[PDB]
Amino acid sequence: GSAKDVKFGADARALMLQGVDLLADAVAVTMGPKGRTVIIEQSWGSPKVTKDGVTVAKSIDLKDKYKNIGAKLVQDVANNTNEEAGDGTTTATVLARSIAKEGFEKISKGANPVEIRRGVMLAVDAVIAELKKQSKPVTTPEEIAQVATISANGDKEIGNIISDAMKKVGRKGVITVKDGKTLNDELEIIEGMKFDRGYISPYFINTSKGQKCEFQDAYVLLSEKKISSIQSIVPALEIANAHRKPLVIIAEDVDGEALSTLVLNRLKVGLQVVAVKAPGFGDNRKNQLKDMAIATGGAVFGEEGLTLNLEDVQPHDLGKVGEVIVTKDDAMLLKGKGDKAQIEKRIQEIIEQLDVTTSEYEKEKLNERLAKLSDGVAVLKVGGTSDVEVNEKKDRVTDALNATRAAVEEGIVLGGGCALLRCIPALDSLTPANEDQKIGIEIIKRTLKIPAMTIAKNAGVEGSLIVEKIMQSSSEVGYDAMAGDFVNMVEKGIIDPTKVVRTALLDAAGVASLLTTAEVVVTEIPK
Amino acid sequence: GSAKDVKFGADARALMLQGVDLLADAVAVTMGPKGRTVIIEQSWGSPKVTKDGVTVAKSIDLKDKYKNIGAKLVQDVANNTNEEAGDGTTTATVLARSIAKEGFEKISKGANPVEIRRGVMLAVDAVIAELKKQSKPVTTPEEIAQVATISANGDKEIGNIISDAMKKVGRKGVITVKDGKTLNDELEIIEGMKFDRGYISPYFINTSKGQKCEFQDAYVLLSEKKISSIQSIVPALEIANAHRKPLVIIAEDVDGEALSTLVLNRLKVGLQVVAVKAPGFGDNRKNQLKDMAIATGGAVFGEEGLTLNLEDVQPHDLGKVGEVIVTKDDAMLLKGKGDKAQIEKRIQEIIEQLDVTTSEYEKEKLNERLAKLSDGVAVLKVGGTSDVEVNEKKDRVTDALNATRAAVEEGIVLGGGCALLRCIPALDSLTPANEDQKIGIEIIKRTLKIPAMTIAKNAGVEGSLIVEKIMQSSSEVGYDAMAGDFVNMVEKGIIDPTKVVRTALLDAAGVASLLTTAEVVVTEIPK
Amino acid sequence: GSAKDVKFGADARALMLQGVDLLADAVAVTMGPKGRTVIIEQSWGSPKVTKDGVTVAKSIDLKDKYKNIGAKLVQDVANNTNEEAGDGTTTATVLARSIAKEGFEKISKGANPVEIRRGVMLAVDAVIAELKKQSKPVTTPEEIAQVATISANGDKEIGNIISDAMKKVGRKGVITVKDGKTLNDELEIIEGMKFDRGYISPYFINTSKGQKCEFQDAYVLLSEKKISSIQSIVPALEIANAHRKPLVIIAEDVDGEALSTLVLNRLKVGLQVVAVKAPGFGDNRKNQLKDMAIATGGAVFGEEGLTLNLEDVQPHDLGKVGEVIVTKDDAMLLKGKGDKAQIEKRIQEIIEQLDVTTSEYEKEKLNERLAKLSDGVAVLKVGGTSDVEVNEKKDRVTDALNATRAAVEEGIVLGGGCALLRCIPALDSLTPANEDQKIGIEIIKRTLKIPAMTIAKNAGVEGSLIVEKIMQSSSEVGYDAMAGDFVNMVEKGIIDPTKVVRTALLDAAGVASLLTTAEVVVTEIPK
Numbered sequence A, B, C: 001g002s003a004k005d006v007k008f009g010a011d012a013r014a015l016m017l018q019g020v021d022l023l024a025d026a027v028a029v030t031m032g033p034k035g036r037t038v039i040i041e042q043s044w045g046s047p048k049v050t051k052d053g054v055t056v057a058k059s060i061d062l063k064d065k066y067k068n069i070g071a072k073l074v075q076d077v078a079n080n081t082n083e084e085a086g087d088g089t090t091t092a093t094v095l096a097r098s099i100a101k102e103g104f105e106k107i108s109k110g111a112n113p114v115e116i117r118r119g120v121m122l123a124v125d126a127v128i129a130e131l132k133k134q135s136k137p138v139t140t141p142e143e144i145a146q147v148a149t150i151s152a153n154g155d156k157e158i159g160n161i162i163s164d165a166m167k168k169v170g171r172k173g174v175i176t177v178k179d180g181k182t183l184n185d186e187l188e189i190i191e192g193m194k195f196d197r198g199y200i201s202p203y204f205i206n207t208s209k210g211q212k213c214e215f216q217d218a219y220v221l222l223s224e225k226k227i228s229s230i231q232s233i234v235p236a237l238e239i240a241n242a243h244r245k246p247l248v249i250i251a252e253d254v255d256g257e258a259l260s261t262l263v264l265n266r267l268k269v270g271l272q273v274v275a276v277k278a279p280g281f282g283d284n285r286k287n288q289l290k291d292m293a294i295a296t297g298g299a300v301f302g303e304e305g306l307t308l309n310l311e312d313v314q315p316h317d318l319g320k321v322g323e324v325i326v327t328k329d330d331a332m333l334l335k336g337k338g339d340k341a342q343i344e345k346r347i348q349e350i351i352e353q354l355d356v357t358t359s360e361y362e363k364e365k366l367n368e369r370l371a372k373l374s375d376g377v378a379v380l381k382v383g384g385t386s387d388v389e390v391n392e393k394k395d396r397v398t399d400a401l402n403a404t405r406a407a408v409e410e411g412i413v414l415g416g417g418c419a420l421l422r423c424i425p426a427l428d429s430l431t432p433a434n435e436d437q438k439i440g441i442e443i444i445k446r447t448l449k450i451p452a453m454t455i456a457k458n459a460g461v462e463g464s465l466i467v468e469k470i471m472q473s474s475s476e477v478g479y480d481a482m483a484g485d486f487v488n489m490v491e492k493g494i495i496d497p498t499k500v501v502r503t504a505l506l507d508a509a510g511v512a513s514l515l516t517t518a519e520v521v522v523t524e525i526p527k
């Protein structure tokens, strides 16, 4: 309907590259141990100071729509890297810039950019195979502290506290971050649980800073049957809201009308309510349901055995937590007010079920239920004197936790951009199908030198000399941009998770090689 | 009522041609195996990268209204080709440009453009007769894989998975495309329903991306009679209001008051409901509704035998699907929660009904019911690392599926624009009625060289030499624009569906020859 | 109340002439067999391509209000000709231009434009008398096919299908046009009826393309008395709400409150309802009511005999149609779901009423009822590959049907503007009263050569030489602008209805001679 502006050829590509270059030049100053921060003006209050790459990327939009298309594409790169890795967004941004630039620099009349994209993706597949080859598994908590220290801009306190947090709880344990009122950071180990079901509707969010629903001292409603009917929720809503306590709803499947009633009470009069789907695809659903009802003090409704209905609800059947956090993909309960004796009875029942099971698949479910009910969670309270320092350190702690989880789950490689420098001979052993595929392979081969060059460039030295010196050294020797020396990267602790590196490379390559294939760009006429 | 700007003669034609040329120049870069992509700015979020011609055509509007008229007419060409064939929109666009240009150039004082249009339509009828003459029936699954590979920009994975899909579900089976969370594509065979009735009111759409109504884990309400009264729908709406699963309504005819109440609940409070007309005409309608109620677990209301009324409705009388998709022209049911024993009993009843029928018209209806209840549905999940790559690959997969359906419907011809090049000697034998019909025949004869020239142009070579060498070669020799050589197009698999080619040519010719009959263009004064 | 701009003398006349000349120059390009089309931009999407003169006229408005007055006056000419003839609007437009121009030219100080207007109307009366003298009745269906072929821009397919439609249904039978989904046109004979009562309130219009009410599978409510009371329509609207079929209300006189209730349900919630007055006056009214009730299956309410009231209405007392079309001046029922045996019994009752009567005035009413029950309805479905093609052919099909009806009603004359050329000696036999009547007679005498000149001018030749060659030839020799030769017009089939020609001439002359009497033009100052 709206009038459109259409551009052709290399002018649209030049404008798109200009937007890509603006956003990636703003992001690339944050890279490494000599990286600097970015101040982002906030419309409501105090401005935000950050070193996190996706926060810099999301904050940038341009009036020029042709530049804004490239800005949005690199934003998609940074957002995908933050979503499936939680770290390495600056690396993905500079890799995407390099692929987009070297792809725009190689488009001619006889060139086929789709075959160039095929070559690019084939070369990235080769490099990810070599990354999986070079990777080694994390076996010592010293490496855990090293990963969390490197990912938190060389903060040894953050790495030590994260290593202690998963020493006390679990390498696959639940570790959370929140604001602290003290100057220094602290770690508290408290009882809690966490399951992988998020909210059902996005209208429940009352905290637009982390897109999550946050209540304190709220009721919790467990049910084996789907909490559906009007006479299933309206007595429940009356009992919950009328008691001066908010309501958390756990049920199997919630789709249709009563959530729209919940939204009508949330948006008009402001009812503090949230609904979460129940985890479990069988008897484990009922088992975890009963475990959370025991830990919270509430009961289970719609069950097969007792047949407790949601019409006749009483206040002494609703569980009480001290805190609940409901995100898009996961929800969690904190400090349930259930009886300690009943919790101990359920823990001993789980032990006696673990003593009579040998199928090696229900045993890990019972062990997960025991780890949920028994050891609790970890909470990092981040110190500082103002909210801007707390927010910047919180971003660093989130990066360090994400990287540490990725290094537990997939392993580690060499840091400082050296693990991409070591994958060049794998591209030197490829045989291209045709010339455009060779162009794509050479594009990826030149792109693999970019993160180390950016790290060294932020350190005030010439990155190409550094990178040449790294390629002429042995396989364990890279650059330490904090110290300014060429060292053994493993024994000095400069290591990266393999998952973060491969996620950044793949998410950069796909979007940037799709951007290279363009010939015509269509934007709207600005009004 | 509004003030108008009126232009006469060749100035209005020149401006209209200018709009046609802008839209078709944006579309023509996408053609062939060396075609490039088009980035379209999206107002909400990330921009859209596409190679599909009708998306580029529909994304372009102009401020100049005289140019916008030609843009809308070529957009109508592309839309009609996408509706009637699902493929070949870029070819229809370049053919429409060629006919519009050659018709605008041929208009003089003594010329009759309506007789020129008559000549155009006569020549296109001749060329479509020759296309139906040259067509060969697809009798190998290798040809299936070749068609789906060519239509998906030379992607052998998409062609292989589509060929395997209709190896599993049948050539006239149903294959669907949806988003995938993995990197690579995969094929899943579910048991599901699909019939050729769409939604009745257009207010039922929730997802505005494909103009379809999509629910998951939804109730299903079937009635042999029309769901007709407020006291028929209000028990059903109170069940879907309380028991909280989306309501899918299968009824004979729905036009009046209760659907307006349904729209009122759709728009004000947001009731997730959809209504679909019943398929079939006669006892086949009742048989299909009984089959659907058996497969979903629900019952049939308003029947002649049992006389189960729509006033007394129970929760255990509604079917439960796992997913429902209702588009404008067809609807679909996924994972009906019916009894397996009841479904098997209905399948054996259908077998025993097939064993006592010999009229050869009810036998194909019974076989269609058997393939509905037994053969199932096919699901293609499209992989990728970002939504833009997934969306562009989904466009290519939809093109390949549409072209494979057209090739099992009407056979195949030569690819690369060669089947239009082979119809020139058919035009070299028509005798024109008069001079203007001769002009129209020559316009079509020059237009028949255009798709091959555009394909060769996008491949970096000069297309007139290519077309001249194809026309001097044998009937089985065309250009391989991917390989840059002259090959056997049947042996190398470069083949097009006949239906796509004739649909594109007819839809281009009609609108372009109607455009070239215009002396006066009336537009609105811009405010 | 608004401030006004007032102009005097020949400047205002020149500006009005300018508007008349703009609209008539846009319309005159469409005239004849070598006429061209006009593209009109539509705000809701695809533009309209047309050759119909009144469609071009109604689409043109000017910003300068002095030109807009003349444009709207020629719009009144074209609209009146389209209303009382259905054809000849381009001829009326060019005649009105000629009279307006030659009247503005002849205005001097001593001239009286009102006696000039009297001369104009006297001369037009003479020419219409000579047209009625030259007219010949249509006796052969070859002339029917010739009229419908000429009126549809010279294709024999529309003429052949229209001639076959009144061979199957009759020359006074009803023939309707709707869009077809096929490429080619086809003729369908359906059983239906048609009376001359339109809608009663204009709020019932749902389809704003032809200002008509369009329902399918609709209830029908017939009453012999006026459907007046609230408790007469609340059971009926309750049944329409409780059964989901649009209510078609047929009653005697409908003026008051319950139609305002119908409008309130039409606009707020959307009740599909329409009310039509009952045709006939007296016993014929109730006879047609009983015929339509026994044809649709419903009953008659408020009757004298059975006394069936509108308070107690049952679902088995409403008729069911398959299609109903309610326009401004007439309504029409298609596919009534009545008993075939009851319809046959009413047919034999009508035959046995015909066999005992000789009054020769209600016998034609009985024959009309028999035709409404037995003769049927022709439906012309228009083919094409796009909606612009379908609309452009549908305008010509409507023009050909209108012309064929006018040629059945009043006969035929020579085509190509020759029947106006043959009326010049009749004007050469008048004796004017004074000199201004002589001026008006000479104005009409010069105007009578304009349609043939415009036809020849659209054919690329000089129209004045053609017209001078026509007047020197015999009375049966005129120009054939398609073939460019002078032929026998009756033998070659180039014929026009007499009614169309006289309607166009009279409607042009009245408005143009009223326009040429103006000394002062008062417009509004634009804001």
Ligand SMILES: Nc1ncnc2c1ncn2[C@@H]1O[C@H](COP(=O)(O)OP(=O)(O)OP(=O)(O)O)[C@@H](O)[C@H]1O
Pocket (backbone or CB within 6 Å): A030, A031, A032, A033, A035, A051, A052, A053, A054, A086, A087, A088, A089, A090, A091, A092, A150, A151, A154, A399, A414, A415, A416, A417, A451, A455, A479, A480, A481, A482, A483, A494, A495, A496
């Ligand atoms: N002392 C060091 N010497 C050399 N390289 C280092 C050193 N410390 C960290 N690095 C490297 O710097 C990179 C970390 O940069 P940074 O954390 O700013 O960006 P990122 O991981 O791409 O993205 P994000 O902004 O999301 O954290 C990693 O490649 C890491 O190996």
Ligand SMILES: Nc1ncnc2c1ncn2[C@@H]1O[C@H](COP(=O)(O)OP(=O)(O)OP(=O)(O)O)[C@@H](O)[C@H]1O
Pocket (backbone or CB within 6 Å): B030, B031, B032, B033, B035, B051, B052, B053, B054, B086, B087, B088, B089, B090, B091, B092, B150, B151, B154, B399, B414, B415, B416, B417, B451, B455, B479, B480, B481, B482, B483, B494, B495, B496
């Ligand atoms: N390797 C090839 N060599 C030559 N011609 C080819 C080759 N592969 C495909 N073609 C031809 O290119 C055309 C396909 O182009 P493309 O799919 O981009 O456009 P389209 O079918 O006109 O429209 P749409 O954009 O809707 O898909 C067909 O005529 C096909 O035969």
Ligand SMILES: Nc1ncnc2c1ncn2[C@@H]1O[C@H](COP(=O)(O)OP(=O)(O)OP(=O)(O)O)[C@@H](O)[C@H]1O
Pocket (backbone or CB within 6 Å): C030, C031, C032, C033, C035, C051, C052, C053, C054, C086, C087, C088, C089, C090, C091, C092, C150, C151, C154, C399, C414, C415, C416, C417, C451, C455, C479, C480, C481, C482, C483, C494, C495, C496
């Ligand atoms: N082959 C022909 N040779 C000469 N005159 C012809 C021929 N065919 C049609 N005509 C004449 O052309 C006129 C028809 O023109 P046209 O139908 O375009 O306009 P119209 O009847 O004035 O109005 P409308 O736009 O409503 O159709 C008639 O006078 C008809 O007799």
Ligand SMILES: [K+]
Pocket (backbone or CB within 6 Å): A030, A031, A032, A035, A051, A052, A053, A090
């Ligand atoms: K950073």
Ligand SMILES: [K+]
Pocket (backbone or CB within 6 Å): B030, B031, B032, B035, B051, B052, B053, B090
């Ligand atoms: K294309």
Ligand SMILES: [K+]
Pocket (backbone or CB within 6 Å): C030, C031, C032, C035, C051, C052, C053, C090
């Ligand atoms: K005309």
Ligand SMILES: [Mg+2]
Pocket (backbone or CB within 6 Å): A087, A088, A151, A152, A399
């Ligand atoms: Mg980091």
Ligand SMILES: [Mg+2]
Pocket (backbone or CB within 6 Å): B087, B088, B151, B152, B399
């Ligand atoms: Mg294609």
Ligand SMILES: [Mg+2]
Pocket (backbone or CB within 6 Å): C087, C088, C151, C152, C399
């Ligand atoms: Mg006409």
